[PDB]
Design a protein around this ligand. Structure first.
Ligand SMILES: [Mn+2]
Ligand SMILES: [Mn+2]
Ligand SMILES: [Mn+2]
Ligand SMILES: [Mn+2]
Ligand SMILES: [Mn+2]
Ligand SMILES: [Mn+2]
Lengths: 483, 483
DNA sequence: AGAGAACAACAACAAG
DNA sequence: CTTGTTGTTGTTCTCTGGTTCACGC
DNA sequence: GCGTGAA
DNA sequence: AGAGAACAACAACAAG
DNA sequence: CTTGTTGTTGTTCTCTGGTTCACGC
DNA sequence: GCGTGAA
């Protein structure tokens, strides 16, 4: 219990052997603080206590190749250890998933990422189920579903009908999940609204393109070292990319005109109306709050799609003081919010918002279909749970919640609020927490590809498909089922 | 002494805690076998022997930030520990160096790499002295020499006149070392001969460009996964790059015509004369033997520039059976070997070859200037060594070697041959081993940039200039002065 | 978001 | 009072959102 | 059969 | 070269 | 005789050779 | 002052 501190003469020698490990093997300084590094060092001081200080270390230490098969061993092992805890959440309707496609930068295999999301004990599960390569077959809808089912067979899940899937609107991905529950990713929808609305407001082409050519010049002339914050290029495939460039120019506006004046290249910025650049940054600033919100899988997120849409309608509210080109942008944004974003929502987005206890809003058109939807889903929950055996009814329990009153406090945690209410609401708070675990976007699959890319590197390029599948899952397992 | 082996019940648990470290912290499997990792694990079993198994590990383990200053501490420390062993080799004329310029792919600083090379105990030293950034100043000759002197001041070397420098023919780098000994890198020279000779033989444009467009199609059509060895693009900035592409096509020729026929794109290869592709690969095959030779710093290399030039003259010897376009290539290659490569050699290249004991060759035009050169260099060695005090003369000892007879055996190691001859030849074998430690090219600086790039990565991009300088040197130190 | 890294800028502490 | 060594705070820089399927006229 | 939409 | 990685293909060995 | 676990051999894939100075007419 | 050579 009472852990002993070593002598300072023995502790300075420990920061000397650690520094020499990072230097010789070319590891990052932060390696000395990994959760698995510490847990491993604790084991090796045990071996010194039992066997003494004269142990054959090379014989004790494993080889990298036997490490490579152990994580493939353990991957098979842990997929069975939870092959039961997983199959329960799918049965009980309370499981959702996100899938998407990615291709790696070296070998160029196309990949199918699958994540899983369900509620446990006041906390959310965020599992990487698998990253299976398509083996260079065409990314047709049939092959995708073929590789989707194959990932779920790893845990003895063969149904897939009770799992709510969240994807982008890729024509081939969309068709794969035509036979089950598919929710449109709201980060791609919000991105479509921005892309189209700027296509449709070409009055703003000249200021944006003018800014784009300043970034292009600072990179070609190797001048970003003079900025305390560098200027960012506009990459269309990145969300809110125009805002990132514009802000990088504003937040460095003073030092940019000076550097430009210095190089006699002052004509590249004098025709740029700074005021409109500032107006677009204030407008798109709230879009970044919504984007970072929609990408949350550690807390409920689907319930905020509808109120975020209202906040977009509020930002682009017509204003008598807008200039002509900004007035037109706000006009096109509220349009595409209607025909691009609202057009591709579902009762899952409204019902998730219903279960946000500040429930005063959609009292109008929606509580009809929401009650019709909520009652049906509490019905299948009983149907399933009665097979688990081998006054205050749901339509009442529905309206009993519909009269609760709670204030928007900054500490309010709706997910905690339903655990602390599972008593009075037994069967509805189960439907609610089934709804509140669905991600509002496919960002969990995006992050899986980022993690994948951290493994398939320049020097680790020979790593195999199943070795990445194994490392990603185990790393996700040791996060969701360890401390 | 007799190191104990642990129980198998305690050894399986060690490959389980190692596998979990690699998984959780996302480290490569090969991390379990680093020289510094093993030396570190040996220390941690000692702490378990002394203090027992209940040690506070988090308090014992250092932070990454205190690791970052320790390697900067140790870097200052070890540059003083050898600030003496280094300054001796420079004094005794037996030190050479290679310098070049590089810029990193993220922050884009220009860098000056400096390596050091001298003889010790039958083995060669290959030191990374420093990678100092120019801080975005212009890479003028004055700033380079300014940063060169600054790297040598780190070890209290202020002379630099006794150090033989080996660089490429960059106009600015060349001018920096106008005041000291500069030897032309022979890898850049050989590369100039190839580049020019192919510019001057445009009859071969159509086969090469035809091959280039097959690689371009296999990459665009994502077809390299069908090849057991992939096709390589021609990058002009890589040495023998045309040979690498051509061979990648030949070694996969059968499977390439089949894949092309399959895609109905068979017209991209039918006009390609395979025989001339094969002739160019056989010719350039020996160039790759010379290139990989010239890049050696663990064994003597400057002494092989002259006999490699002969082997190039021999490969491109006129042959009555050559076709017209190959006959012209060999004609232009032997030309540029004369006006590009031989044009930029020095008596260091001839004298280094002289000290290869199979010394029958240059008996003609060169032993005059070589004797004149060797006698002067043995003279400054005595001048220096007499200040170290606070029959069989050199001109005889020169000719005594000039009558030795030795056979080219495959095990022959000339560097070992001069240690085992320092007795009969005391003062000449010192000049010889001073000559035999000079690198034939600047590849040591190239490799320093490769190592640098292994540190300045995508996620380690915030690492500082002096932190890379420190890590590179210490890693080089622990290789040249440890076991 | 939610991952991996590094470090400038301070704040606490010790030795002197 | 100084320096000289450690520890924590908070900013900056990375990456995934991608490159061809499905459909309708 | 070919242009269009969304990645 | 001379660095960093991974793994297919076998070879040795053990358990059964 | 089978499998099932470990260890070694040898191949394949990375990167640096680079992006602007110096000079002469 | 501008094209050329070598990175
Ligand atoms: Mn997609
Ligand atoms: Mn990508
Ligand atoms: Mn160079
Ligand atoms: Mn580069
Ligand atoms: Mn995606
Ligand atoms: Mn170079």
């Amino acid at each position: 219990r009472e852990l002993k501190t070593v002598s300072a003469d023995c502790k300075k020698e420990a920061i000397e052997k650690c520094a020499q490990w990072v230097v010789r093997d070319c590891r990052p300084f932060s390696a000395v603080s990994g959760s698995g590094f510490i847990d491993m060092i604790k084991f090796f001081i045990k071996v010194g206590a039992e066997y003494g200080e004269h142990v054959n270390v090379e014989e004790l230490l494993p080889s990298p190749i036997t490490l490579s098969r152990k994580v493939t061993s353990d991957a098979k092992e842990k997929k069975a250890l939870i092959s039961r805890e997983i199959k329960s959440a799918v049965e009980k309707d309370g499981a959702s998933a996100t899938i998407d496609l990615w291709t790696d930068n070296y070998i160029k295999r196309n990949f199918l990422g699958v994540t899983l999301h369900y509620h446990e004990n006041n906390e959310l599960r965020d599992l990487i189920l698998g990253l299976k390569s398509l083996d260079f077959e065409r990314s047709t809808a049939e092959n995708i579903y073929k590789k989707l089912k194959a990932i779920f067979s790893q845990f003895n899940v063969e149904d897939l009908s009770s799992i709510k899937f969240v994807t982008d609107r890729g024509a081939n991905v969309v068709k794969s999940l035509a036979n089950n529950i598919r929710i449109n990713c709201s980060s791609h929808l919000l991105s479509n609204v921005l892309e189209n609305s700027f296509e449709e407001t070409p009055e703003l082409n000249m200021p944006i393109l003018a800014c784009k050519n300043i970034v292009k010049y600072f990179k070609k002339a190797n001048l970003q070292h003079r900025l305390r914050s560098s200027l960012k290029s506009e990459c269309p495939t990145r969300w809110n990319s125009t805002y990132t460039m514009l802000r990088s120019i504003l937040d460095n506006w003073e030092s940019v005109i000076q550097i430009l004046s210095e190089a006699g290249e002052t004509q590249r910025i004098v025709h740029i109306n700074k005021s409109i650049i500032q107006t677009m940054v204030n407008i798109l600033d709230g879009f970044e709050r919504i984007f970072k919100e929609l990408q949350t899988c550690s807390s409920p997120s689907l319930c905020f799609v509808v109120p975020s849409i209202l906040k977009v309608k509020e930002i682009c509210s017509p204003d008598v003081g807008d200039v002509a080109d900004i007035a037109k942008l706000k006009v096109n944004i509220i349009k595409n919010v209607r025909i691009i974003w609202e057009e591709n929502l579902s009762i899952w987005h409204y019902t998730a918002f219903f279960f946000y206890p500040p429930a005063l809003h959609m009292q109008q058109e929606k509580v009809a279909q929401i009650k019709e939807f909520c009652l049906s889903k509490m019905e299948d929950l009983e149907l399933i749970n009665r097979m688990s055996s081998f006054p205050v009814s749901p339509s009442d329990e529905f309206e009993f919640y519909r009269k609760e009153i709670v204030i928007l406090s900054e500490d309010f945690k709706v997910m905690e609020w339903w655990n602390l209410n599972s008593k009075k609401y037994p069967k509805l708070s189960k439907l609610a927490l089934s709804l509140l675990s669905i991600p509002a976007s496919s960002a969990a699959s995006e992050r899986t590809f980022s993690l994948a890319g951290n493994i398939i590197t320049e020097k680790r390029n020979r790593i195999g498909q199943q070795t990445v599948d194994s490392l990603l899952f185990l790393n996700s397992f040791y996060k969701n089922f360890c401390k």
